[PDB]
From a paper:
Haemoglobin (Hb) is a tetrameric iron-containing protein that carries oxygen from the lungs to tissues and carbon dioxide from tissues back to the lungs. The haemoglobin molecule consists of four polypeptide chains, namely two α chains, each with 140 amino acids and two β chains each having 136 amino acids. Distinctly, the SMSs are warm-blooded animals with an advanced circulatory system which is capable of maintaining elevated muscle temperatures up to 33 K above the ambient water temperatures at a depth of 150–500 m with a diverged air-breathing mechanism compared with other vertebrates. The SMS haemoglobin (Hb) structure belongs to the family Lamnidae.
The SMS Hb was found to crystallize in monoclinic space group P21 using the hanging-drop vapour-diffusion method at room temperature. The crystal packing parameters for the SMS Hb structure contain one whole biological molecule in the asymmetric unit with a solvent content of 47%. The sequence identity of SMS Hb compared with human and mustelus griseus shark Hb shares 41 and 80% for the α-chain and 35 and 66% for the β-chain, respectively. In the β chain, three deleted residues (45, 46 and 47) were found in between the C and E helices when compared with the sequence of MGS Hb. All known cartilaginous fish Hb sequences have lost three and four residues between the C and E helices and are thought to lose the D helix in the β chain. The superimposed root-mean-square deviation (RMSD) value between the MGS deoxy T state Hb and SMS Hb is 0.518 Å and between the MGS deoxy and MGS carbonmonoxy Hb is 0.912 Å, revealing a high degree of similarity in the α1β1 dimer. The RMSD value of the non-superimposed α2β2 dimer between SMS Hb and MGS deoxy T state Hb is 2.098 Å, which is smaller when compared with 11.170 Å for the MGS CO form R state. From the quaternary structural features, it is learnt that the SMS Hb and MGS deoxy Hb quaternary structures are similar and adopt an unliganded deoxy T state. The SMS Hb has four hydrogen bonds and 86 non-bonded contacts in the α1β1 interface region and shows the compact nature of the structure. The total iron–iron distance of SMS Hb, 135.35 Å, is comparable with the T state, while in MGS Hb the total iron–iron distance difference is more when compared with other liganded Hbs.
Author numbering:
A (entry chain A), C (entry chain C): 1 to 140
B (entry chain D): 1 to 42, 48 to 136
D (entry chain B): 1 to 44, 48 to 136
Write the structure that this text describes.
């Protein structure tokens, strides 16, 4: 599913995320909570904005993991199994939430990156879709 | 939200004739199996089914005003119980499957679309106080 | 991830569906159109009920493909690739339609089958979700 | 639908001064690359011309934030009854618009302002979906 041109583009995006995973993460989760408040139901937080300590914490973990998925483009099924088990069996997050978060990550990049062309967006969205798929795979 | 008479009658007569408690109990057990993550929150299935079915009857009693009767139920789900609203239709879709089970050939695509519509109205009502 | 009990139940449901594919498929489609009329957009039909001749024809094709998928539980990616290309690139079906149809096939089974336990329903839904996933795999 | 003044102002000021046709043109173009199956309706052509149509309708919703449903009757019938647009694909357009508003507004596109635009578009999606039967 990954063309040479997408692999390159994902690589470059991964490197920029890696520099500031908590900032990117906290913002994407703040978007989630604002545009889909049902997602707040999983989190016992006082502050659901990007300012929130616990939002920052989860946000970095999200983005660090996306970065790693990016460094695992041809292995994603095996690479993501640990996380699929935690989300799917321990935390029991309803799988409908993964593609909401994906779109919130994409919107965050659009507000930040000098360049977010339709080709680049397509590339990242493909990475996020594969991530959502794996994270949704160990529920039942 | 605008209802046809056929829709009002299908929903009202079913509630007045079928054992919707029994339907609920089975729909809860179904949702737990098909959608295991929904068991997180939960106990007796039949006693909880009674309370759920109470709320639905409340919705049927007031088909034009479901939201306004659902305020407090909605707040409880959002603020105290912290139910993911994205999971509401997994219960209501299980209800449809148990309705299909009961009604068999009478569960026509038309009648099926009636229950779908009723449940969507329910979902919107119980989702309304998530902020 | 199909347990032997799931494999066996799926096998059982597949033989049932195999007996009357047009019957089952035309009903599942009339359900799709009735519950999700946005789905009619793809079909230049005059009759969208299970009595429609073109409903019956697509219906049979759908159900036979499910039956045949039920024989490929271990290699659905390879198996469904042509169908994924056809739906994704030629017919250009918005993928959100696939789970709507799946649920409509589940309801159809529930109105007809001599036994539709939560265990059996889960087994079938997992198959259908696997199918939806493949058919959504070759859009981009 | 009830609206705060910040919601009205955020939408209204944006349509007043932003180059909304250029936004629409890029959003449409984006939606084609990100969601290719959506180009199926346009085989049957300038993205820019089409954006001008959409943007006029958005402006119509803007001018009437409290009665959008009522202004979209004929628009919606056309999409359901003549053009055969899958209504499940409407948000692919509006989500691309949101991506284009993010690109214009940068850090001003806060999660909060983001949610104003999502609310706006869902009212629009509901309005243009209302005549699918
Ligand atoms: C790309 C998607 C996501 C990734 C990569 C991700 C990653 C992670 C990681 C690495 C952890 C710590 C897990 C551990 O300690 O083993 C975690 C915790 C957690 N995740 Fe996610 N996550 C994602 C999406 C989501 C979504 C969409 C939700 C619900 C809407 C969610 C809910 C949670 C919760 C509740 C915790 C526990 C900590 C807390 O309450 O803040 N996750 N996640
Ligand atoms: C959409 C249809 C639903 C209706 C009509 C409904 C209705 C209700 C009502 C009326 C109550 C009691 C409120 C009170 O305590 O005053 C309740 C409690 C509860 N609900 Fe729901 N509910 C629905 C969906 C769900 C779903 C999908 C879940 C979980 C996935 C859920 C989880 C719970 C839990 C954990 C309780 C507390 C039960 C107890 O402590 O015994 N509900 N529900
Ligand atoms: C389980 C899922 C489905 C399966 C297995 C399936 C299978 C098939 C098959 C075998 C054909 C014959 C086309 C060919 O290969 O020559 C076909 C045609 C077609 N399908 Fe599907 N389909 C499924 C779901 C859907 C959905 C959800 C839609 C749209 C809502 C759709 C839209 C179409 C259209 C527009 C055609 C061809 C037009 C025509 O038949 O006249 N399919 N499908
Ligand atoms: C949801 C936001 C949308 C708005 C506000 C909107 C608005 C409009 C309007 C006002 C028209 C002109 C109808 C007339 O008076 O003849 C139109 C036409 C059209 N729309 Fe949409 N539309 C939207 C979404 C879509 C989407 C998602 C598609 C498909 C991807 C689409 C496909 C078309 C086509 C093919 C035409 C006719 C163009 C022509 O042949 O002249 N529209 N739209």
């Amino acid at each position: 599913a990954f063309t040479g041109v997408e692999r390159s583009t994902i690589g470059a995006i991964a490197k920029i995320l890696a520099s500031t995973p908590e900032a990117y993460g906290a913002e994407a989760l703040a978007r989630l909570f604002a545009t889909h408040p049902g997602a707040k139901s999983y989190f016992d937080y006082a502050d659901y904005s990007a300012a929130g300590a616990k939002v920052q914490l989860h946000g970095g973990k999200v983005i660090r993991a996306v970065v790693s998925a990016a460094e695992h483009d041809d292995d994603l099924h095996a690479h993501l199994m640990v996380l699929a088990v935690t989300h799917g069996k321990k935390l029991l997050v309803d799988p409908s939430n993964f593609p909401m978060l994906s779109e919130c990550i994409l919107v965050t990049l659009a507000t930040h990156l000098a360049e977010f062309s339709p080709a680049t967006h397509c590339a990242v969205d493909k990475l996020l879709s594969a991530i959502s798929s794996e994270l949704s795979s160990k529920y039942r | 939200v605008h209802w046809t008479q056929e829709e009002r009658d299908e929903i009202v007569k079913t509630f007045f004739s079928a054992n919707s408690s029994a339907i609920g109990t089975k729909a809860l057990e179904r949702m737990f199996v098909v959608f295991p993550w929904t068991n997180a929150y939960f106990f007796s299935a039949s006693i909880h089914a009674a309370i759920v079915v109470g709320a639905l009857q409340d919705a049927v009693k007031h088909e034009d005003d479901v939201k306004a009767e659902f305020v407090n139920i909605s707040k409880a789900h959002a603020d105290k119980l912290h139910i993911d609203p994205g999971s509401f239709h997994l219960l209501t879709d299980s209800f449809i499957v148990e309705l299909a089970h009961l009604k068999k050939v009478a569960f026509t695509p038309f009648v099926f679309a009636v229950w779908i519509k009723f449940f969507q109205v329910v979902i919107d009502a119980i989702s309304s106080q998530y902020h």
